[PDB]
Amino acid sequence: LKFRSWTYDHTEIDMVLMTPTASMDDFTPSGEWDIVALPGRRTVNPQDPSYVDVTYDFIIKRKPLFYTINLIIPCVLTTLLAILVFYLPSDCGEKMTLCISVLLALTFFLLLISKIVPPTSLDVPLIGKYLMFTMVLVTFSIVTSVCVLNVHHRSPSTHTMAPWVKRCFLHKLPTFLFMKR
């Protein structure tokens, strides 16, 4: 908060800060925010007269339990549901539903978190960057799930199994990943 006068200047009035800290006497606690310190200073520029200023700094902590209990838990929830479409077998027909629904929930929380944030481009918050990372990961999950669902529905009458997938995906890798038929 920058207090100064528009009529007079430093050549006609001083402006003396009395106490170093603003008092906290009739303060009612806000319930959402916390005042932790209230310093105050008097700014004058040498080699630039007719300048007076008394500024008060308010450094304010947040009580964070509301946005935690309403946004952080569904964030880590829908992120935990994103490495989960691969354990579902492709013989059922419910993989693309789960993938599209996880990406839908992530875009919903991204457009929700872009509302409570100010529209500045200094830096994005860590929630938006985290959801952007997980959203790109879920999109790569969708394209590799469609690619891994194509090889499930390959019949012997329409395709020929090449010898390189014989030597790679049947002998070396089922022993590397502890499958063993």
């Binding site: 992120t79 490495i83 691969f86 960057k129 985290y130 990372f133 590799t144 990943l177």
Partner: peptide, 20 residues
């Protein structure tokens, strides 16, 4: 294979973002 790969990449991503 892709389950293990994306799990490992997601763990390294969470560590590299929330390191501080």
């Amino acid at each position: 294979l892709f389950l293990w790969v994306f799990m490992f990449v997601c763990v390294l991503g969470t560590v590299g973002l929330f390191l501080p």
